[PDB]
Design a protein around this nucleic acid. Sequence first.
DNA 1: ATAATGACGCT
DNA 2: AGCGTCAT
Length: 430
Amino acid sequence: GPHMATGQDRVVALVDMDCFFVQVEQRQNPHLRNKPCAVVQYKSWKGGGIIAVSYEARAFGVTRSMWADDAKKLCPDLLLAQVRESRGKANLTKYREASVEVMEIMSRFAVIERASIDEAYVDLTSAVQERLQKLQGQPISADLLPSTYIEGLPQGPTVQKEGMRKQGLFQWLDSLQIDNLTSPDLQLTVGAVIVEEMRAAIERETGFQCSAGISHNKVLAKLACGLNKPNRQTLVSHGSVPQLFSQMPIRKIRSLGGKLGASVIEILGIEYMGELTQFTESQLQSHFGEKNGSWLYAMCRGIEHDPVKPRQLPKTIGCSKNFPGKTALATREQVQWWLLQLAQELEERLTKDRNDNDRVATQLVVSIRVQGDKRLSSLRRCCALTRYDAHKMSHDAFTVIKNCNTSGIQTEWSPPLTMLFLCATKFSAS
DNA sequence: ATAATGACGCT
DNA sequence: AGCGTCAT
Ligand SMILES: Cc1cn([C@H]2C[C@H](O)[C@@H](COP(=O)(O)NP(=O)(O)OP(=O)(O)O)O2)c(=O)[nH]c1=O
Ligand SMILES: [Mg+2]
Ligand SMILES: [Mg+2]
């Protein structure tokens, strides 16, 4: 009983920017603020693919992956901003630079793990200990958690949203043990007070709003973070897991959203995270392998161990472009030209990277897709990266792939190429 | 005819 | 090393 390791040793947060690219455009262009807007890339085919949607536009049914002309059918006052284009391709530099803004602020409170362009995990265990010594042993106010939700509360014996939020918050605080510094519920509560402050600083200093989740691990933090977007944070406690998971679709836990989670549903014949507790670990390892079974056995009990790695900077810098339909690259003049375009954006980013973060890449990864191939990558070969020069890299990339050209003649390329990819990896201090 | 990325796992 | 999974 006492000998069951309950996974409450750490405080972990996930901070995720709300409709990030839309917010980045709305700061630049006031005209777009507090209106239905989407961010699109490439206007030509159907008015553009949408990649980010404001919450106002979401309310009409606009989703990412949508064509902008379909979007205008559900939402005719939709406003659009389009991604920058350079050298024939979408260029995400604005949002990368806006991301650095936000990660840098986050870094002041705690070590962060950049998880994507718009979210980072936080390990607040140490900071919580400090704020807990500072706090003598005094109660925690609800004024210190003005945007926090407590998952599972309220329960027991106001019908409008903000009032409901405070009721759960006061229920949570009315049952706190504020004299016990190793009480994991107190620890979470304190973590969420820091995340209120970290989130105020972000919006104070950037104009960007975010949501967040505060729990004991990365899966729960991520999952908590999406229960009350936008502009809100959510505390998932160890004790709230069994109710939460009893109706939680398996596909919603991170890394179960694909073929693994579909096979858990299909082999086990279940639907919800909580039905995994029935199985023994050995059982789950026979169905799903040694690491997954172990991982699943703890995860359904709300235990996960993957640590917040100290890594604020990407490990790979890549540029890619699809050539869909009858835009597939069929001449070798054509393949060279786009390999050079890509290599010029890669060169400029690598030079900025070196001056920014004092490191040089040593390996260039080339990848193409051919037309009619059913995989998303047909080939991927490495080669040495010794100079940050676009023509050398694109020359090197071409020779690494030139023998994929099966066309009978010299100047053609067959079958036509549907994707090109250049990535810099293997960084070393400079 | 989503598209542009970026991390991590398997052999 | 090259490929595959899952994510955002
Ligand atoms: C999911 C996803 C997002 N993005 C770009 C713009 C998104 O704003 C940036 C951050 O992703 P996110 O947090 O999953 N989506 P969001 O920030 O727009 O919306 P939310 O407020 O977090 O729900 O993702 C893509 O470019 N491809 C994607 O598949
Ligand atoms: Mg976001
Ligand atoms: Mg995100």
